[PDB]
Amino acid sequence: DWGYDDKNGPEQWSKLYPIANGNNQSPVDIKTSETKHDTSLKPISVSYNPATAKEIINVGHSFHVNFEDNDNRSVLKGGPFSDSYRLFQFHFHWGSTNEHGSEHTVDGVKYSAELHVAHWNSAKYSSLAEAASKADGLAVIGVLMKVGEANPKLQKVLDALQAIKTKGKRAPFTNFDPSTLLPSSLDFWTYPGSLTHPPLYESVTWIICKESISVSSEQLAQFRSLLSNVEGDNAVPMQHNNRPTQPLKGRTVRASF
Ligand SMILES: Cc1ccc(-c2nc(SCC(=O)Nc3ccc(S(N)(=O)=O)cc3)nc(O)c2C#N)cc1
Numbered sequence: 248d249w250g251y252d253d254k255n256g257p258e259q260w261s262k263l264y265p266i267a268n269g270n271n272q273s274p275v276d277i278k279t280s281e282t283k284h285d286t287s288l289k290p291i292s293v294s295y296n297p298a299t300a301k302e303i304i305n306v307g308h309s310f311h312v313n314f315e316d317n318d319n320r321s322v323l324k325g326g327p328f329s330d331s332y333r334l335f336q337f338h339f340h341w342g343s344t345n346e347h348g349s350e351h352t353v354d355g356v357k358y359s360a361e362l363h364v365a366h367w368n369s370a371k372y373s374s375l376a377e378a379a380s381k382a383d384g385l386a387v388i389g390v391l392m393k394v395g396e397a398n399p400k401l402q403k404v405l406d407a408l409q410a411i412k413t414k415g416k417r418a419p420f421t422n423f424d425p426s427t428l429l430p431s432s433l434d435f436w437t438y439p440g441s442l443t444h445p446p447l448y449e450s451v452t453w454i455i456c457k458e459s460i461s462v463s464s465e466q467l468a469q470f471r472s473l474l475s476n477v478e479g480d481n482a483v484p485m486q487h488n489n490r491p492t493q494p495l496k497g498r499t500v501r502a503s504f
């Protein structure tokens with residue numbers, strides 16, 4: 248079973264997932280002196296229906312908030328896309344201390360956490376399963392989370408975690424629009440990349456927001472107090488789940504700004 252421990256963690260993933268050492272791996276360090284302003288990039292447009300929010304789940308290495316993805320009620324458009332992308336999930340990554348925890352870095356700076364809002368190409372493909380095997384199948388919005396003031400927009404999410412404390416627990420999570428978590432500016436970087444954990448498929452168009460959102464030290468502690476163990480076992484806190492940055496291998500990061 249893959250994880251983030253020394254034995255099952257990012258450094259070992261290449262043994263069952265050799266794409267780990269591929270040419271389009273994520274995350275990356277965004278060097279602002281090497282980005283290329285692209286005039287053809289349209290603004291990002293999100294239109295999410297809060298009725299598509301379904302369920303929150305403890306998946307052992309992280310937690311996921313899933314959405315109903317049977318129709319186009321909740322869609323991403325614009326940016327580098329011709330196609331509409333259908334929201335299916337959001338989740339976070341964090342680190343063992345405030346010093347690190349983001350997956351993407353900007354000019355070598357590490358943030359405390361990172362929000363991923365994940366979508367699949369419903370213009371071209373008819374399921375997440377089909378879309379995840381395609382170079383153009385997935386679109387993920389990444390938002391860097393900078394330790395500081397408590398973020399009240401996180402409140403429904405953090406309040407839900409006490410019902411999913413241990414691995415495999417799940418609960419209804421309804422009437423939530425995750426566009427409320429995005430920063431006020433949607434200026435972005437984009438590059439072609441991958442899932443940041445197994446199976447590490449090179450199927451993702453990344454959209455990284457230049458503006459951070461806030462999170463308090465105590466809000467991060469709530470993520471780290473989730474348990475990776477099943478109920479009844481010895482408590483094993485979910486201390487971290489961020490992958491180190493990977494080589495660009497000649498990819499261009501483009502800037503909308
Ligand atoms: C043996 C095996 C089989 C299936 C899987 C598996 N498959 C999938 S494919 C569904 C998918 O699109 N996942 C996804 C999307 C985005 C990101 S991120 N962090 O934003 O880059 C991460 C994950 N997902 C897993 O979580 C998992 C998991 N776990 C892994 C291993």
Ligand SMILES: [Zn+2]
Pocket residue numbers: 338339340363443
């Ligand atoms: Zn992620």
